[PDB]
Every structure is written in C-alpha cells, then in structure tokens.
C-alpha cells in the first residue's frame, strides 16, 4: 500500500502562519519529485509548487499567486516533504494535496510527467469570522413583466438563516437560494417571490429574516422606489 | 582565473551526431555553475556521483564537455548503467560516473519540414561499446552466416540510421541536445575550482 | 493560461462523450505530453491518462485519449452511471509550469436539457446610503447542472468582486445557483449599465439593469 498523506491543517488567522507535512510510505522517496496541489472550495485545482530531488540542480519553484510567501523544503531522513506558508491571505482557504512525478523518474525531461499517487488532502482556511447580525435589504421589482419581489440578506454568521414571507401566509412562489461563500468567511443568500401585479397596489408583501445564532429580527416591506 | 568559456559548447550553432559525439577540455578557468544552469532553460541537469549543494567549493585537474543530439525518450540511457541502443552502441558512460549530464529541447534547430536526415545513429554492432568509447566505423554489418565482402546487400546491412526530426511531431520524438560534463581528478595541480 | 474546458459534458446511458481541452501553441503545440485526471465528489483526484495515450493498468480500458495540434480529446465510451465525476486535463509550460483545465462535469442525462432562467437585481437605495452596492445574479432551472458566469459594465468585463456559488439540486431535478458582484456606489454611477451573461450548454443568456431605471 503506498501512501502519501499530509497533516498539519486547521483554521489560521489572516496573516499567520503554519506548516503542512506530507509523509510517504512505500517506496523511494528520494528519487521522486514531490508536487503541492491546491483546491479552492468548489473551485478547479490550482499547482502551488514543486521539489526536485538531491542530485538535481536547482531550487523548488512556487507559484506567482504564492511566490515570496510559501516555501517547500525536504528532508530524507524523515521522508517528509514541508510546506511552510506564511502572511497568510484569506485567499488561501483551500484544501492540499501532496504529490509525486512519475515520468520525470522515467523520462529524465520536464516536458513529459504525470502525477500518479496523491494524498487525502488537508483543509486551511483563513478567516477571522465570529458571531454576527446579517443586513437585510428589499429589492423591489422593474417594469419586468406578474413581478418579481426579493430580499437580500448580507454578511451574516453563523450558518444557518431563515427567511420567510408574510410570516407564512405567503408560500406559492417563493424561492430561496442556498448562501454564498464571501472570501471574508461572511455568508450572503436571497430570497425571491413572484406575485401578480395587480395585486400589488393591494396586498402587502413583507420578507421576516430571523436570524436565530445572534437573536436577530428583521421584518422588512418590499416598496417600489422611485426619484 | 577567469570565467570558465561554456560558451563553445553549449551555444554552439552546430551538434554532432550520437555516434560521433564532439568532445572538448576545459582547464586553467572558475567555473560557476550557478551562473551556467541560469544561463537558460534546461529540461535535465543532473548530477552522477558529486553533490551539486557542493559544486562551487570543489577543484579538478580538468573537465570534459562531451556533445551531441539524441531524441527525447533516448535521454534516460544517458546515465550511469543504462542499456539500449545508444546506451550500447554510441555513447556509454560508466558505473562510477562522476559528473554532470545537462540535456535541453531543440526543436526550433534540429528539425525540419520533411525530417532532418543530416543526424544519424549507429543500429548494427558486433560488440557492446566500452566506457566513453568513440566508434566512427562505416563497415558492412554482417548479418548472416554468408560473408558480406564490403557490398550492399542484404543480410549485409549498413550500420547507421537516420532520424528524420519533424516539427509537428510529439516531445518524444523531438530532437534534445545533450551535453556531458565529465571531471577527472589526478596527482596533478587542479585548473578547474569553483569561486 | 489556464486551458480551457467546457464546464459540462453530458450523454445518454451508453454514449460516446468526448472532453477537449484547448492549449496554446507553448505548450499543447510544442508536444509536452498531456495527462487526464478524475475526480469523484469528495475524494482527490485520480491519473487516468498519460503521455496523451497511455492508460495505467487498473484504469478501464473504455477512456482514450488523442492529440491534435494544440488540442487533446478525452474519450469515454459504454457512458455508465458511475462515471459522473469531474474531470480535469494538465500540461507543462516553458513559463506557467503546470497548468491545469477549468474542469468538466460530466452528467448522464436522466431528463432532457433545461434552460437557466436568470432574474437580475440593481444596488438598493438603502444599500446606497449604508455606502455599499450588491448586484446579485439568480440563475435557476436549468440541467444539468454546471454554467458559466460573467458580467459586464456598460460593454466591458468585470472582474473584481465576483462571489459565483455552485449548482444545488431543486426539487424538481434541475439546478440553481447564485453570483454577486459587489462595486462602489462611485462605480455604479460611473456606468450607464450593468449585464450579467450565463453560459449555458453553448448558449447564452443574459440580464440589463441600470442607474436610471427611476
Ligand atoms: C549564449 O548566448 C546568449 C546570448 O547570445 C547568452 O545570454 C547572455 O546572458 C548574459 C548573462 O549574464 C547576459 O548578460 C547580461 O544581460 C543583461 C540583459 O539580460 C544585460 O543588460 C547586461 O548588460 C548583461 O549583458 C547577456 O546580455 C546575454 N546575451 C545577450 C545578447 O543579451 C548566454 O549566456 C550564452 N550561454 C552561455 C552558457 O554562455
């Protein structure tokens, strides 16, 4: 069973440090050379960087996002490849991967290689979010012709939030949409209703946000604005 | 003193062929590694035998830059204790290598529309080559029991073989130039150190 | 450079499909042999193909792979329900280094191709005053479930602030999702428009507001 796992992750404050391990086991890991693979949350796969091996000249190569912050080192004895970053950003939330290059064993040329065995994966993520009351806004509708009424709830925390319409009364039409990731750790969602329009010069339509995490209410008409 | 001149060998407008790989010494100069390997952008730099963190400290009675072209999948059988055929019938290196063997891609030079037929290879060999021999022989191979006699027939085949570099082709196939750095150290006054 | 890749392939149980990913002339042109990796839902990603040909010994014999020019293809065939993954194409570069596709979400259809309907929202008033602007773009209704975001002031594109979520299943098997683009009211008012353009199945549809819709 050849392996590769990586550990150290967790939560860190913008702008601090830490220091992720990638550990082998089974084979010779002194002549592979060892690739960190990053993955934003619901995001594409991103290479950080690289690492030759001891009898290779030259210097591990990171990437432009990254370059003069994060730093990858080796020891053999131990058979564990370092990852130190620090000055951490918020945009380094992502989860790790640990990698060797085969076809550079085969091959002994950069143009062809392939990675082969991967790791599990560690999580990071940089945030300093706590507790906190969201911001509710009402949208009103255009001349977009029935009407579209919503509400936008705003730089909220923790997960999760209800919303209602009406308090209840109204539910045929009502939709809410599932929250947005913020690279501040702030979460955002809103909640839209299609009503008729001739209706709307009688009836009342009101969005009731209880945010419960932080004892929050917020009851708020939907009203056609004008200048 | 001065700077070591690998400027010759590696700029050079024109390689030799693998089974008649150029050689040149290089003596009485500093080498700078560092300065040579960020010269340009290399695909392989690799170093048999010597650590390359202690390069710019070590001294030398001469060196040796060996040159030539292969293609891309041929650049594993230049190492120590490698086999195929250009590792058995052009160049061999040997089991205690010490050196450095750099190799880069040179497609925009060594290939043409058409193929490239002007770099050959030796394909026919009685005998396997020894440690950094140089075999430029054009003889009839002997293939069969029947005596060849010098004439071009069949079962008398001729020893080398054309590449034939094309562009389009992919990176296995393209044309690497490959240089060997080979250190000799006797009992004699070292002319080659580091700064 | 990153390479492109269309953000979904779909097909019937037992189709063909076929994922290209598209380089440029330094480095899917100058041969630099392309690898196929596959990733599941929640796990790490997985070699499928190397060399643009070649397939390791336990990877299903049913994945090919091809190069033309600057171009490689990927090509699944017996399309199974287990094949749903993402799927991603990597190249090395004589100045990016490693660079790897947007990625491709492959679906087998259980329901014909749905449409987005996009509802676009302006900045509220009250927003204004607090000194901030959201735009808020809904995309819903539409299978299966991967499209692609981009907005627009006035003509021109807009990159920064842009939060795009991902595609959650509705109750009625389709997708939604949402994005938001955040600006200065000074931004805002400095443009006589603002449009939100999603790319869906090769098709795209998009929304108009503005600062003068009084
Ligand atoms: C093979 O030849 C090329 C040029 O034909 C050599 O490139 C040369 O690299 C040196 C590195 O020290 C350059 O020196 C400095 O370059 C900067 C510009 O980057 C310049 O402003 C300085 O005044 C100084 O010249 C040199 O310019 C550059 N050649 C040219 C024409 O710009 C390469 O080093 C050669 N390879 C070997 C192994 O010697």
Redesign the pocket.
């Given at each position: 069973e050849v392996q590769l796992v990586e550990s150290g992750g967790g939560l860190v404050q913008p702008g601090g440090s830490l220091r992720l391990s990638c550990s082998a086991s089974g084979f010779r890991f002194s002549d592979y050379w060892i690739n960190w693979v990053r993955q934003a949350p619901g995001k594409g796969l991103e290479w950080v960087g690289f690492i030759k091996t001891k009898a290779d000249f030259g210097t591990p190569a990171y990437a432009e996002s990254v370059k003069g912050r994060f730093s990858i080192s080796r020891d053999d004895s131990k058979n564990t490849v370092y990852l130190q970053m620090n000055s951490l950003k918020t945009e380094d939330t992502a989860v790790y991967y640990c990698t060797r290059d085969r076809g550079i064993l085969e091959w002994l040329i950069i143009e062809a290689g392939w990675f082969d065995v991967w790791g599990p994966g560690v999580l990071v993520t940089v945030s300093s979010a706590s507790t906190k009351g969201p911001s509710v806004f009402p949208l009103a509708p255009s001349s977009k012709s029935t009407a579209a009424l919503g509400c936008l709830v705003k730089d909220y925390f923790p997960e999760p939030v209800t919303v209602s319409w009406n308090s209840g009364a109204l539910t045929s039409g009502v939709h809410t949409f599932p929250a947005v990731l913020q690279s501040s750790g702030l979460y955002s969602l809103s909640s839209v209703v299609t009503v008729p329009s001739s209706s709307l010069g009688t009836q009342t339509y009101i969005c009731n946000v209880n945010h419960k995490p932080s004892n929050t209410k917020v009851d708020k008409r939907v009203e056609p604005k004008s200048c | 003193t001065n700077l070591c001149p690998?400027?010759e060998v590696?700029?050079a407008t024109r390689f030799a062929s693998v089974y008649a790989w150029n050689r040149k010494r290089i003596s009485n100069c500093v080498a700078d590694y560092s300065?040579?390997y960020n010269?340009?952008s290399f695909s392989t730099f690799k170093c048999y035998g010597v650590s390359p963190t202690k390069l710019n400290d070590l001294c030398f009675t001469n060196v040796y830059a060996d040159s030539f072209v292969i293609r891309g999948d041929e650049v594993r059988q230049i190492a120590p204790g490698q086999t195929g055929k250009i590792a058995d019938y052009n160049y061999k290196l040997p089991d205690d290598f010490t050196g450095c063997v750099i190799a880069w891609n040179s497609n925009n030079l060594d290939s043409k529309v058409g193929g490239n037929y002007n770099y050959l290879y030796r394909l026919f060999r009685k005998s396997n080559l020894k440690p950094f021999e140089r075999d430029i022989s054009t003889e009839i191979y002997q293939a069969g029991s029947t005596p060849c006699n010098g004439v071009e027939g069949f079962n008398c085949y001729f020893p080398l073989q054309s590449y034939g570099f094309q562009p389009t082709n992919g990176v296995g196939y393209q044309p690497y130039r490959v240089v060997v750095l080979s250190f000799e150290l006797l009992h004699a006054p070292a002319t080659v150190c580091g700064p | 450079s990153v390479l492109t890749q269309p953000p979904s392939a779909s097909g019937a149980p037992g189709q063909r499909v076929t994922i290209s990913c598209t380089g440029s002339s330094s480095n899917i042109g100058a041969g630099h042999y392309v690898s196929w990796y596959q990733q599941l839902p929640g796990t790490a990603p997985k070699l499928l193909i190397h060399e643009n040909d070649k397939r390791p010994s336990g990877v299903s014999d049913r994945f090919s792979g091809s190069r033309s020019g600057a171009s490689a293809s990927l090509t699944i065939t017996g399309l199974q329900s287990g094949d749903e993954a993402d799927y991603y194409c990597s190249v090395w570069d004589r100045s990016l280094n490693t660079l790897f596709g947007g990625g491709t979400r492959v679906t087998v259809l259980g329901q014909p191709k749905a449409a987005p309907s996009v509802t676009l929202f302006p900045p509220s008033s009250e927003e204004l005053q607090a000194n901030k602007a959201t735009l808020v773009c809904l995309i819903s209704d539409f299978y299966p479930g991967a499209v692609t975001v981009a907005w627009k002031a006035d003509s021109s594109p807009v990159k920064a602030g842009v939060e795009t979520t991902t595609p959650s299943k509705q109750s009625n098997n389709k997708y939604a999702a949402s994005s938001y683009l955040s600006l200065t009211p000074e931004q805002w008012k400095s443009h006589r428009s603002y449009s939100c353009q999603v790319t869906h199945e090769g098709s795209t549809v998009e929304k108009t507001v503005a600062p003068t819709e009084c």
């Open positions: - | 690998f400027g590696f700029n300065v040579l010269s340009a | -």
